[PDB]
Amino acid sequence: MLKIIIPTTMLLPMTWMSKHNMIWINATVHSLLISLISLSLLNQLGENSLNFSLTFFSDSLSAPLLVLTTWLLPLMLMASQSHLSKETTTRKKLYITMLILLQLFLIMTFTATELILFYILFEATLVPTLIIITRWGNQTERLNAGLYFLFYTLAGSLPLLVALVYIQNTTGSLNFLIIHYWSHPLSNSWSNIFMWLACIMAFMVKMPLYGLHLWLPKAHVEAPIAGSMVLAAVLLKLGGYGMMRITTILNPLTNYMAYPFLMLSMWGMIMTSSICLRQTDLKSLIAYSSVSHMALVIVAIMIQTPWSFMGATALMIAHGLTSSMLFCLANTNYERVHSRTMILARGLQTLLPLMATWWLVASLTNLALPPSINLIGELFIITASFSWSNITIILMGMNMMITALYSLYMLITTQRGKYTHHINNIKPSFTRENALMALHILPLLLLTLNPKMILGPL
């Protein structure tokens, strides 16, 4: 699959050789072309994966993730060029270089055939994200956010590395196909328990799991808009993809090692949904929303059924699109009024009607209105959990009630009521912002038209 990797590496010098006032145009055009090329990976088989070479392969789980990454790059470029107008040419090129390097690392991460190569790329994604956050964030807290983003990740991933090399000394291979075909059960010993924890905790902190999630509100609030987009839409899904890959060697230990994580996921989903009800910062609300949806995904991965895996795949794709759109919507208001307080600017439907329509559609997809793929993933996970235990419908049910509430709360706070009298600098929406919202939302409904493309290998 070098036909996708090489054009991004070519985006790099194309950006660094462009004329000073053509960087955005060229980057956007060729990013969109690369997304169009990557669209061909959706032609998948029913039996095995597309094994391109000894190094790269494509499954029915990673292809929609690659398509989402390549589609998110142009949207990030469109969202970034407004607040970077005053920047120097070299620093703008460096920012675009960070975005391109992040895309390259993600593309290679989602298609690596070996687990150590996957680990190396999945750690390599850290550097551009940290640089973006700590260099182009707006407030002084960004520095702290960066630290919280880094060590929380590494404290999870350093044990995993050890486990990985240990496994290669035991079975002789880390190739995923060999690992799947030559699978052997895990006995019930303390050594196996700690191997399970080492294999699981890095992905758990990536999702993130409730209790290990404190880095996420900081990092996703303090980051620039493109950073928040790529953190919510793609980088959270690394944990889910890695967990679904790694669980093939953890049976039957998972059968009882999942209980603390299942309890944490369900109760913390309720807790983060409740937290969303009392939030003064609009970005923090969206971050805690991401935490709740990812708790659902964790439950789906932990119960290990075909329906739960399909639901997890659909939910990851849908959440990526929806959360990126919500972050962009909040960023428009922030750029207008330079404040993230939700109750500062009210009654925006009177001043910006089309943006209010975009807000309504985004909040409708957040609460999983049928037949959106958000609802499809949520319903598949809920059905699988009901099969796992009939009592789960209580907690899941409560979540469905809370989500809508806070979702509509957000809308009602920003669009309805009366406008703030002293805010007189609310200009009409630009074509760029409307196009960004449309390019977020139209693929969601188009995917609803054909849902088997995001349902995964199961």
Partner: protein, 57 residues
């Protein structure tokens, strides 16, 4: 009829004829251990390269 030796004659290294057999193991040595056998054959490229993690060469 005795002649005193000249200077440097008593310090010569001489030869002696004896019927005493030459001892074969005057050190009472044990049998020496056998060495590691050898390296033999032609050198061929390493099968599938280094085989280090993901590297194919």
């Amino acid at each position: 009829g005795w002649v005193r030796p000249d200077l440097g004659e008593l310090s010569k290294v001489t030869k002696v004829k004896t019927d005493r057999p030459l001892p074969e193991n005057p050190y009472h040595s044990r049998a020496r251990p056998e060495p590691n056998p050898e390296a033999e054959g032609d050198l061929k490229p390493a099968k599938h390269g280094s085989r280090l993690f993901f590297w194919t060469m």
